DNA sequence: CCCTGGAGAATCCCGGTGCCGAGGCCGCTCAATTGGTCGTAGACAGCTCTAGCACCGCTTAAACGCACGTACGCGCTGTCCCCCGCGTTTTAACCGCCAAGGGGATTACTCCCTAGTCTCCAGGCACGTGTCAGATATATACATCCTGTTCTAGAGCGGCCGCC
DNA sequence: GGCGGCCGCTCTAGAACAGGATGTATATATCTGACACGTGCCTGGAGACTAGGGAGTAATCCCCTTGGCGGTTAAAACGCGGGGGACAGCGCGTACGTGCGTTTAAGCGGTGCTAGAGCTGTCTACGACCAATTGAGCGGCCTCGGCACCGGGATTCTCCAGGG
């Protein structure tokens, strides 16, 4: 999580940074995979025939 | 033994027609030729017509 | 003189970006609320609801429609389409046992 | 209480499929995801109405939803 | 000439029989010895019961199943009848496996 | 104990598929089939190899692979 | 299972009948969604377009 | 029809405000910590004996492979109608402010019933066994599916008739 | 006398229908193998009893969600333009359905051995519980700064128009 709040330049943790931190690891993905983050979206990926 | 003989027009006659259901055999003896199997079952039955 | 006339997809596509990386809840607060209490009272009349538990009722039924939008949108490629349908979400719902 | 089934407007299922990277929406899908969202709100809200109705309270408290949501393998972290 | 069975009627023969028939498809040494097999890569000095081979394996063909049929229906939401293994990776993807 | 991973045949992977209604089966349906096996089984027989280390035994019962495959939801009748 | 049991002509309860037996029932399906049954199989249904 | 230059608009980097939620401090009090003491679950040692592991005949239904063709996956085209982008005007969403009164949370008294034993006995389990429904087996019989032949409708052609 | 129009004739093909084929639906014959009934225990639940402790109930309280107001500006909704995509349709081909030859191992039955899981003692540290205690977690309060907000500016990616 620390991770994600550095690359966009945020020093305070905010639950997207939680639910980033999460998804991002395939190890945390398949333990928290039937888990629901409150305020924290989901990852910001396009497939690839959707790209203009 | 063998691979043909039938005294009718042969299909590859075991001694059984293969590529066809057991239900279609025949083991009565007669008089049983080669000729070539029937020279190459009736020249691919005259290409195919 | 000519319009801008952005073709469709594009901007979509923009929602796209600008609202996986937000973290804002997308449905708004009353006409969920609402829908709760209505719901609620085919089951139990005179019942009420908590602020935060009307909020954890919203974010969750957001993020399972989003995996289920997910699904659903991955289904489309599947199917060799980019426009989601009925029995897209259908199909899903079966999959998923539901 | 009526008519509280369109307060999940067409624009508000249409953000919520960008948040998913949906591409398009069909016409048909609003309706097909108001009766999704009236299906699983419906589970929940009865489950927690049970857990409400077990504690003799008659306020549905936060508590209560996640452990509507936890056993149906739909946890909620912080509530 | 043969009766020439159109593709399909036998298929669809198949799949009336074993949808009534509790007989088990996969056979009994070629599915235990893959279960030695998996397992060797965890523990070497390992043992397994002729009845926990057969309670494993009734899972896995309940399993690959249902994901069959979750396959099959993915063809016929993707315009298809013939299965594919992107078909497979979305029945997966959707139930949360892979 | 090797290349047992082909030991699931392909009438037997057949057979499944027209258990589940499959009509028409495609040649790379097998090898995937197969994939998802092995996966599905990596997982379920190494539950089953804690649960029969922890219980002090060498050899896998039936019963701890009903543990293993009940806490992945998936529990077995009849052992 | 017994009204199962009937329709296959069998007076004796097998895992084929207690399978179709909860299949059957709605609730009970939903219930044993994720339950396996041994020696069960599935229901006999076939999708409608891929009937001849 | 495709490549490239310029400009419209939503998005990204940046300076200034500040504010309200986060970081730090004070008690202090209730839950974490220390020591002792037993009933007791558990690790350890020996027996065993029932089920799994390894190899062997065999035979036979299951499985690899090759020949063939027709249902079907896939490539391509149009269209049109179904869905998106944007202008306008309502609309109810969010926020600022106010009481309310059912209701969550806390404390206390007390009272039922559940924790914990004694004894026993009648239902539940291991063992033994006659038995009655299921499976194997096979001629018989369904049973639908595939295919061949015939029936009838449709379009094309040619002969005949009337008109200019 | 030439030619357009009309009707009859033969060719062709779609489709309903009947017959053959092969894999299953049943009618016994008989095996057979677990099913359930009977028996003999016997081991866990039940009647009865003791004691105590956690919730039902009553009271309080303060607190928090509902109703209820408007302001306002963000956004839903309506409609117009239009534009790119779902799908009907068609064509290619390949690759997977069907079928048997051949092979090869699945599985039934058999035999032998031992890997080791219950089973029974044994003895032993271990954790719930009881006095006794004590120290930082948390409610609350003071402080403070990171990013929301508000603009300002800008690179910067993107679409429309012009040229080859």
Known sequence: ?52 | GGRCLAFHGPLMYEAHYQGWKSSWDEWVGYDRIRAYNEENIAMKKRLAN | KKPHRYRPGTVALREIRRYQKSTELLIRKLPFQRLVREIAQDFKTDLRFQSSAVMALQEASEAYLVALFEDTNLAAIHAKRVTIMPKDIQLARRIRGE | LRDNIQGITKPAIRRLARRGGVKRISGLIYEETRGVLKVFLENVIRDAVTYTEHAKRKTVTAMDVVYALKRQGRTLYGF
């Open chain 1, 1 to 52: 999580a620390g991770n994600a709040a550095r690359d966009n330049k945020k020093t305070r943790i905010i639950p997207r940074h939680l639910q980033l931190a999460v998804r991002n690891d395939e190890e945390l993905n398949k333990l928290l995979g039937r888990v629901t983050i409150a305020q924290g979206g989901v990852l910001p990926n396009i497939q690839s025939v959707l790209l203009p």
